[PDB]
Amino acid sequence: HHSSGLVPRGSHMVGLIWAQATSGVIGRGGDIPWRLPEDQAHFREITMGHTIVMGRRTWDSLPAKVRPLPGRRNVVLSRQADFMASGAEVVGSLEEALTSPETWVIGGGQVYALALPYATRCEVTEVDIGLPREAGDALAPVLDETWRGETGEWRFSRSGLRYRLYSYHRS
Ligand SMILES: NC(=O)c1ccc[n+]([C@@H]2O[C@H](COP(=O)([O-])OP(=O)(O)OC[C@H]3O[C@@H](n4cnc5c(N)ncnc54)[C@H](OP(=O)(O)O)[C@@H]3O)[C@@H](O)[C@H]2O)c1
Ligand SMILES: CCc1nc(N)nc(N)c1OCCCOc1ccccc1C[C@H](C(=O)O)C(F)F
């Protein structure tokens, strides 16, 4: 059955957006092990003007100078009663965080897994870098058969890596 690209203001659309290596790695040692300008631009194009929800460790991985990310309501998930995020809201659950009509979950590994049962869209960048999975890595969620996907062709980044975009939807 079909979904619409229009977001009625009384609904709670939840999407996830992440960049991964072909192995599924999204993070290691509290950082993202690549930077692709095309991915950075794409991330801002999708999320700008909406609420973004992130795990506390993803907030930590943002340089202090740049957070909160501008042009978006920044919401941070933490179970620690004394964690604070200057300029942003800290909430203790996904239920508290998903109050906007359109919310983009922007990481990390734990929060993607937490948010997936409520999500109806995923926007994925795949980077053609040979990074094998190591213990402790943050990993992308795996999408079951209820998701229908559009896979873009391989493109070439100014930074010299191949990459491609996926768009997934479900009802
Ligand atoms: N490639 C990408 O697209 C991408 C995007 C974003 C981040 N990343 C990377 O991914 C890594 C971070 O991912 P991660 O999995 O380690 O952590 P995370 O998902 O970003 O954040 C984990 C934290 O979220 C909080 N949390 C988790 N479940 C919760 C729940 N049910 N209710 C409330 N709070 C909850 C906890 O904070 P407390 O411990 O404070 O309770 C937990 O420690 C970093 O390397 C980052 O750079 C990659
Ligand atoms: C761009 C990576 C990415 N890509 C997709 N496709 N989805 C995501 N969720 C995603 O992580 C967004 C959150 C992590 O952002 C940072 C991590 C460390 C340092 C700086 C930033 C800010 C970014 C930057 O300037 O690199 C800015 F562009 F947002």
From Swiss-Prot:
Swiss-Prot/TrEMBL catalytic activity: (6S)-5,6,7,8-tetrahydrofolate + NADP(+) = 7,8-dihydrofolate + NADPH + H(+)
Tell me which domain of life the UniProt entry assigns to the organism this sequence originates from: Bacteria
Q: A GO BP term, please?
A: folic acid metabolic process
Keywords of this protein's UniProt record, alphabetized?
A: NADP, One-carbon metabolism, Oxidoreductase
Binding residues annotated for substrate, in chain numbering: I17, W18, A19, D39, R44, R72, Y112, T125
- Gene Ontology CC annotations of this record: cytosol
Where on this chain does NADP(+) bind?
A: 18-19, 26-31, 55-58, 77-80, 92, 106-111
The residue ranges of the DHFR domain are: 13-170
- Please summarize the record's notes on activators and inhibitors of this protein: Inhibited by isoniazid metabolites. The prodrug isoniazid is metabolized to isoniazid-NADP adducts that inhibit the enzyme at subnanomolar concentration.
Q: Which family does it belong to?
A: Belongs to the dihydrofolate reductase family.
Q: What does this protein do?
A: Key enzyme in folate metabolism. Catalyzes an essential reaction for de novo glycine and purine synthesis, and for DNA precursor synthesis.
Q: What is this protein called?
A: Dihydrofolate reductase
**UniProt organism field:** Mycobacterium tuberculosis (strain ATCC 25618 / H37Rv)
Q: Give the encoding gene's name.
A: folA
